[model samples]
Target: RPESELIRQSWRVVSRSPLEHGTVLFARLFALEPSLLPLFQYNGRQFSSPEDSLSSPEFLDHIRKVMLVIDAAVTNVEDLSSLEEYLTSLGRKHRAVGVRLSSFSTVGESLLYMLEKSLGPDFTPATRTAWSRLYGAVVQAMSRGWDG
Candidate 1:
């Protein structure tokens, strides 16, 4: 099954928005699942609430910038050599920020959760598997190109 129409439409809007897609993604994920907050906080420090990051202008900005780069890279895949360099740099930066490969699973989990929340009963197992496959392909492609 394909993704819900609502998610696809929302993605179109998100794609057109000047706001970073990553910011939107992180916002939705953090909003629906508060338990993931400590993953983003400083050294396992707990914030007043998970909503804090979702509402944070700075965090949003960071995610937005990350998404902007990602969008650019994906759109300009013909120049894949440069894209590889960019991915390598991104991987290094993510490492610098203490984001690990293992953490990507958390992101995937958050994405699936968001889809379920946004789509209700429309979030079927087939759609969930499709999304996971799509997400994994993108990440794997980038990871193979990423030197770090």
Candidate 2:
């Protein structure tokens, strides 16, 4: 199904700094779910604060990859098979890194929260619903890879 106009339009705001957006999203995500921090730790180093974590080169690179994937999804939202294929491969990679299907829910929640904060007045109920639906579709497809 095609994305609602609201989603397409709102995503434009987000696309402006896709990598930066992911950085913010991950910061909030790790803050809201501290247990997830260890999952991204590198070289036996631990971040003393969210600011420090977001500053790490590894973390920044991770967000860059995330933004790129999100950009692909946004560009192909109307193309179901393409999106699914992309997400499925992503899911497999995530699973290999110990990511679980349930983790996507945490990611979705944090993403919506970040979008609402970032978009401010532009983040309408319709926009939220559209994004939720888009995340749902992506997560659903990604879940398939976990099951397989």
Candidate 3:
């Protein structure tokens, strides 16, 4: 599937069946980009491959729950109160994992690169630019509010 389609479908799946689909998403994403796995975990499981992590259904579900919370926060950006609440919670959790604001940029880069690889020709420059802007603005707003 194209990256744009994957993005839309993935979000839809997350919104609908977050637990099941989210696990799949985290599993696949972590598999393709192992670097991101550490961002999600605290102790950082010593896995040779993303598949190793996905092999555990319980862990995957936990990951899904976390992703669901994040998806809700980002998707409901218009709700300031909700957004702030989520960002604050995320800030606390991220702090525990030693995540700085700078780390998010790396995730964004990985996401865009994966999208392009998945979408291939369908991932037009215009679409990529628009998605990047949308994601950047949302994260920037969240981070600013989180810092404050």
- Which candidate comes out best when scored by lDDT? 2
Candidate 2, clashing residue pairs?
A: none
TM-score for each predicted model, relative to the true structure: 0.56, 0.88, 0.55
lDDT of 2 by residue, 1-148 (tens): 4346676777788888877788778977877877777677677787767777777889888888877776676776676577887688789888888766777888888889878988899898878888898888888888888866
Residues 1-148, model 1: lDDT tens digits:
2343333443344466545445546766566665656656554555667557766666677677755664554354334355655666666667666556655666666656655655567667776775676455445545653353
Worst 10 residues of 2 by lDDT: 1-10
Which lDDT value does model 3 have at 117? Answer: 52
Candidate 3 per-residue lDDT, tens place, 12-62, comes to 534565555545545556655667655545254555666666676656766
Worst 10 residues of 1 by lDDT: 1-10
Give lDDT: candidate 3, residue 28: 53
Q: How accurate is candidate 1 locally (lDDT)?
A: 0.57
Give residue 31's lDDT in candidate 3 (0 to 100): 52
lDDT of 2 at 78: 71
Better of 1 and 2 by TM-score: 2
Return whichever of 2 and 3 wins on lDDT.
2
Q: Let me know the TM-score candidate 2 reaches against the reference structure.
A: 0.88
